[PDB]
Amino acid sequence: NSTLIANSMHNMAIGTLMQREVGREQPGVLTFLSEQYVGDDTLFYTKL
Amino acid sequence: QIILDLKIDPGERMDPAVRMVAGVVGHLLFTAGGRFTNLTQNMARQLDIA
Numbered sequence: 443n444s445t446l447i448a449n450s451m452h453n454m455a456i457g458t459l460m461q462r463e464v465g466r467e468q469p470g471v472l473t474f475l476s477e478q479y480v481g482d483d484t485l486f487y488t489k490l
Numbered sequence: 491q492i493i494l495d496l497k498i499d500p501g502e503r504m505d506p507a508v509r510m511v512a513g514v515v516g517h518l519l520f521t522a523g524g525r526f527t528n529l530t531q532n533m534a535r536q537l538d539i540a
Contacts, residue, residue, distance in 0.1 A: 462501050469500075 446481060453479045457486075494520075494529045496536050513540025 461474055476487040516537040520528045529537075 465501050 449482055450479045453482065453484055457484055493527065494533060496533050509540050513537055516540075 457477055457479065461477075464472055471490075473489050474486060475489060478485045516529075516533075522529060522534055
């Protein structure tokens with residue numbers, strides 16, 4: 443009943459991990475402006 | 491022999507009320523009296539601001 447919800451929210455967790463790691467390893471190189479998750483797809487708008 | 495200080499982490503995201511409550515808690519928890527101290531002057535300033 444909640445396949446899409448589970449996949450998207452798992453994607454949300456994975457996204458939070460990648461943002462945390464990239465912020466830790468390189469401070470200030472990449473700043474995230476927007477994040478979206480749908481199904482198995484993710485999208486980030488950032489400033490380089 | 492051990493003195494506390496504040497930790498800064500940009501990646502952490504917390505509700506603003508946590509700092510405001512911790513400001514009250516720190517005054518009742520620690521000692522900065524005239525004989526010994528538990529915290530650095532900077533942490534005392536941060537707690538006062540909170």
